[PDB]
Amino acid sequence: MENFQKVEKIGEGTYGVVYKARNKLTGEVVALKKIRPSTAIREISLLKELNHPNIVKLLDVIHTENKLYLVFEFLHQDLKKFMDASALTGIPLPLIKSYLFQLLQGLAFCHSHRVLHRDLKPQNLLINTEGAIKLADFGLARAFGVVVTLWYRAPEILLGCKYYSTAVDIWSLGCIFAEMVTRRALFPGDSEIDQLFRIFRTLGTPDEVVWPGVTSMPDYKPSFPKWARQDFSKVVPPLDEDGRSLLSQMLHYDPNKRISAKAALAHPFFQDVTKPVPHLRL
Numbered sequence: 001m002e003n004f005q006k007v008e009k010i011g012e013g014t015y016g017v018v019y020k021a022r023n024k025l026t027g028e029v030v031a032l033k034k035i036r037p038s039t040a041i042r043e044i045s046l047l048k049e050l051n052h053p054n055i056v057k058l059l060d061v062i063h064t065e066n067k068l069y070l071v072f073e074f075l076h077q078d079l080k081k082f083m084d085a086s087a088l089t090g091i092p093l094p095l096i097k098s099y100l101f102q103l104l105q106g107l108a109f110c111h112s113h114r115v116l117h118r119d120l121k122p123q124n125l126l127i128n129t130e131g132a133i134k135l136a137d138f139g140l141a142r143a144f145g146v147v148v149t150l151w152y153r154a155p156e157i158l159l160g161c162k163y164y165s166t167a168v169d170i171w172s173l174g175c176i177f178a179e180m181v182t183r184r185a186l187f188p189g190d191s192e193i194d195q196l197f198r199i200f201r202t203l204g205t206p207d208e209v210v211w212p213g214v215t216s217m218p219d220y221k222p223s224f225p226k227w228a229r230q231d232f233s234k235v236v237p238p239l240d241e242d243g244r245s246l247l248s249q250m251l252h253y254d255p256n257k258r259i260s261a262k263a264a265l266a267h268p269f270f271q272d273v274t275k276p277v278p279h280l281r282l
């Protein structure tokens, strides 16, 4: 805009590009998101009053020249970049644990306020020098709809469910947790069906036993290949059993059986959680 000095383009978005900018008056540095209904307008208002240490703060909302700008507090780096930077050595387990614990707190907060993220991915998880990690880009969907990454998409979404629950965010976080641990995306599909089948090849093709109602889903086909489930010990090898048991609950096929963020925070895996400081290269 005119009140902001676009410093640099710090990425993209499913609705617009995000820039690093300085408030030419208050000297503050922010992340400015330029968006290309009304329920969306009011829904954005809900987000503005959604304040939590693990949620990127939405500072200002500017609707002018029939265009929409969102001003967010600026964070130092995203998790995708950090994971890449940590690929040779891996992110230390205590930090992986700290990040997961914090994201679950953020999700528990959002979910308790009936807010769904819907598109969690490393690129929209932001970190700072003090060890915090925060949820950014709440998809702003449900009030916004109709290359895109499908790697973290929950199976019920892939199978055509139109009304998904808070459980889809737990699935995405589970995929991210695995990736931090193995330094490899868990389900790197390149199409909706490839995404779906990679999930099936690893967790087994779901059936009515493990997922009641699955065969009645919009996009379910009796013709899907029937793959046997693999052992978690081979899925995320370096992870101890507490970690694997938590991951398994975050990746249950049935949205109803999938662990809630609140219940996840009480899992034994977090008994020894701490808040280490990451080594960030900015």
Ligand SMILES: Nc1nc(Nc2ccc(S(N)(=O)=O)cc2)sc1C(=O)Nc1cc(F)cc(F)c1
Pocket: 010, 011, 012, 013, 014, 018, 030, 031, 033, 056, 070, 072, 073, 074, 075, 076, 077, 078, 081, 082, 124, 126, 136, 137, 138
């Ligand atoms: N507040 C904020 N700070 C950011 N910082 C930042 C991100 C990546 C790097 S990197 N690539 O590691 O150098 C550095 C700094 S992105 C961002 C945001 O809200 N982003 C944002 C907001 C939306 F509304 C939708 C969306 F997809 C993203």
